[PDB]
Curated annotation (Swiss-Prot), chains A, B:
The seven MCE (Mammalian Cell Entry) domains of a single protomer of LetB resemble seven beads on a string. Six copies of this linearly configured protomer associate laterally to form a homohexameric assembly. The LetB hexamers form an elongated tube consisting of seven stacked MCE rings, each formed from the association of six identical MCE domains, with a central tunnel. Rings 1, 5, 6 and 7 are dynamic and adopt open and closed states. Residues 234-310 are annotated as: MCE/MlaD 3. Residues 1-104 are annotated as: MCE/MlaD 1. Residues 115-227 are annotated as: MCE/MlaD 2. This is Lipophilic envelope-spanning tunnel protein B. Disruption phenotype: The letAB mutant is not sensitive to lauryl sulfobetaine (LSB), but the pqiAB-letAB double mutant is more sensitive to LSB than the pqiAB mutant. Double mutation also increases sensitivity of the pqiAB mutant to caprylyl sulfobetaine. Induction: Induced by a defect in lipopolysaccharide molecules. Forms a tunnel that spans the entire periplasmic space. Is probably involved in the transport of lipids between the inner membrane and the outer membrane through the tunnel. Forms a dynamic tunnel sufficiently long to mediate lipid transport directly between the two membranes without the need for a shuttle protein. Binds phospholipids. Lipids bind inside the tunnel. Required for outer membrane homeostasis. Contributes to membrane integrity. It comes from Escherichia coli (strain K12). Changing residue 202 to N: Well folded and assembled into a hexameric structure, but loses its function. Belongs to the PqiB family. Homohexamer. May interact with LetA in the inner membrane. May also interact with partners in the outer membrane. It comes from the Bacteria. Changing residue 82 to N: Loss of activity.
């Protein structure tokens, strides 16, 4: 077979003879040996590519080191029980190059298998990582490919890869929400905690929905990752100038209509002039009741010793 | 290859033929055999360095013993399931030395790969250790290199190693806060516990932020590790001479402004003259309201059987 020299910054995890160099699953090359440079400043790894894939290491062939994703077995010790840290390779355009520089992260998604790659803006990564599942009706239809930091450092961008036979689900009006960790709630007569998804509890997950009247999403389309299922709920956003938010909370303050909750507070700000404004998301079923002469009244719970409404 | 004799204080974990002697990942030497000294007082380990790295063991080449970091798999027994305890080596300046003394800890960070090394002062280590991750937007961008005790014994100094492609994040006005363990909170109608980061729960973590108007941090720059995300919040620190702190707590005592919390007590001391002074951090949005004729009033919650404000 052939032979090539890659330049790594740290030969940790790479062992000669064992570590493979695979392209989209199939093993291709094998690490021959690791050796320090003359100045002992960069690591030169020798790889033995197959004698048939001599046209893949042309000029732009990128090599990088992968990891077993560290899913509850790498964090809790157990080093010699997971993964092999292979060397991912992506073929290039054209040259006779035989000395490469290892990339510090895997490149963009250049493949084309009819499966979607969409982007999700987020304020932060949450408890996601490469390998977190994307769900539709709690059916796994994709996975988090990789995440990057937004150029303006204001958020992160996650890359979700929806598998081929499910690309009809991602409509242009879909909504992705984070389902991660545990949501143990406690109240009085109602301190009920239910947990069903285990993988979401370990390495997080995303979920999405699909309206039935919007066009299918194209590749590299951008959505926004909501914090939870509740924050993703549709409904009209109305603005309130409320007197002073005292018992009000940014969420969990309902808009009751005949005892049925038909909305919630979603924003509770403090304007410069001392005025406390807010924003409330209203169920689309009662938007027809938001007219000129419709009041929205703060109401306090009375004792009412008759019923006492505990 | 060559051959050298290192002087260890305890040959525990070192096994002949198996334990390697690696420099920044790449295996170089191999432990030939362990033998006691003539007086049976110090351990002489024989190492077989490669025949090409004969200019690395010059005079100042430092050798030390490493460990698999004891992450939930070394503490819970499981001895023969993690790590190999290799011998780290750092090349020296110049001589023909062939008999070394093992260092009891790894030396300073002398490398230069364009990646940052910053220092974090702390009152104590917290639940951190070599290998705890440093996060930006919950994206791992670094790791705790090693920790030392401050010369004056008053605190500890942690050494954080921010990777190369992320050094633009650490601004000179950044703020690092400890994210470690679990923060299970319980209240009445609100006893909500959420956990997302698993590695932070096991072996702790640090997180930091990045202002958009300060210069990038240089190497060996010093920051202060805050206790949590809350203690790191920016805002102006005002001083109060309060009458007697009775219902006040060092934290979790808000400064309400029209029902919206715009500050908190952060310090609650007792001066010698019997005067109880305090310090309160105020949201930078209401600093313009801190003028000469602005009062700050203690207020107790009334029954108010109408609403009762539970």
């Amino acid at each position: 077979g052939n032979t090539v020299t890659i330049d790594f910054m740290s030969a940790d995890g790479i062992v000669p003879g064992r570590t493979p160099v695979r392209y989209q699953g199939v093993e291709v090359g094998t690490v021959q040996d690791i050796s320090l440079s003359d100045d002992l400043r960069k690591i030169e790894v020798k790889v033995s590519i197959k004698s048939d894939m001599k046209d893949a290491l042309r000029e732009e062939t990128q090599f990088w080191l992968v990891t077993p994703k560290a899913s509850l077995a790498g964090v809790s010790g157990l080093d010699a029980l997971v993964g092999g840290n292979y060397i991912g390779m992506m073929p290039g355009k054209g040259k006779e190059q035989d000395h490469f520089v290892a990339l510090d992260t895997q490149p963009k998604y250049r493949l084309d298998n009819g499966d979607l790659m969409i982007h999700l803006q987020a304020p932060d990564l949450g408890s996601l990582n490469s390998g977190s599942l994307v769900y539709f009706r709690k059916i796994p239809v994709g996975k988090v490919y990789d995440y990057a930091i937004n150029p303006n450092k204001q958020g992160v961008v996650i890359d979700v890869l929806i598998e081929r036979r499910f690309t009809d689900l991602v409509k242009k009006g879909s909504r992705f929400w984070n389902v991660s960790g545990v949501d143990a709630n406690v109240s009085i007569s109602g301190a009920k905690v239910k947990l069903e998804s285990l993988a979401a509890l370990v390495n997080g997950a995303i979920a999405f929905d699909s309206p039935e009247e919007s066009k299918p999403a194209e590749a590299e389309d951008t959505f926004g990752l909501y914090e939870d299922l509740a924050h993703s709920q549709r409904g009209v956003i109305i603005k309130l100038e409320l007197p002073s938010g005292a018992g009000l909370t940014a969420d969990s303050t309902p808009l009751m209509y005949q005892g049925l909750e038909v909305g919630q507070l979603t924003k509770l700000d403090l304007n410069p002039g001392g005025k406390v404004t807010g924003e409330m998301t209203v169920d689309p079923s009662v938007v027809t009741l938001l007219r000129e002469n419709t009041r929205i009244e703060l109401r306090n719970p009375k004792l009412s010793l008759s019923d006492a409404n505990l």
